[PDB]
């Protein structure tokens, strides 16, 4: 979800409804967890570029003072803005930050590469994966671990040929990424290492989370796009 | 009475009626430090600010006489900033009054990717 107003939140499909099509050049999420392949896909017609963090961001947020001339530059380069964010946190008391820049025009091709891997996969195939072999990128309160590194998940399921195609498409879509050595998670009060990093998270369906999968099927466009 | 079309308008949509309330003000002050005439490069910096203890407001951040100011554009009545209709309406007001060749959106709030807001109830 995105955006808390009292008790009310925007679900990812509601956020897509709150945004006009093909108006914004970019959306910058100063918010945790928004560099999610599903979220970027849901918002693919809402911007040309999505600049966001796949993990949590410190409360101080993005370095607006330093970013300002970059955001308003005649030759806007969002990779520079992302680098300003990263370099700020790298040199901060709490050096914990992840960032990625997604080029939405390349998401349809990436979807096809992922569809060709996941559409024939069964619950048995997916539930056979051991989460311990993939980089976890989310530690929400009471979560058993739902969001993992996108590359790590796909690498576990793809044939070598499929994987090569995926990497070619991934590199066209994720045009810039950076991470500090560790990422900090509020619910655990600790920072944990990032050993594998592509810039985007994905849901890893697990046998203990059938209700989460049912909701994802019904409400997250990516599911029907790549699993069916 | 729209402003002359400029090179860029950026809208910062701040949903801060939550635990980030205290940090929204710090982020706005950071924007004020950066938003000089030279740095804005003719562009518009507009902020929709929805904090905890008061109704939302629309602000323009712009330098005048050597000082970057928060200029009050309007006060909204109490409204759900997470309602997509409200977001669309604010975006429309901003784009209409501050036309540009290019637009950017900063979405500022809590986030949990695609997860349902009631995810804690879907863990068993």
Author numbering:
A (entry chain B): 148 to 375
B (entry chain A): 24 to 147
Task: Quote the original article.
As part of an ongoing project to characterize commensal bacteria in the microbiome that inhabit the human gut, the structure of C11 peptidase, PmC11, from Parabacteroides merdae was determined using the Joint Center for Structural Genomics (JCSG)4 HTP structural biology pipeline. The crystal structure of PmC11 now provides three-dimensional information for a member of the clostripain C11 family of cysteine peptidases. The enzyme exhibits all of the key structural elements of clan CD members, but is unusual in that it has a nine-stranded central β-sheet with a novel C-terminal domain. The substrate specificity of PmC11 is Arg/Lys and the crystal structure revealed an acidic pocket for specific binding of such basic substrates.
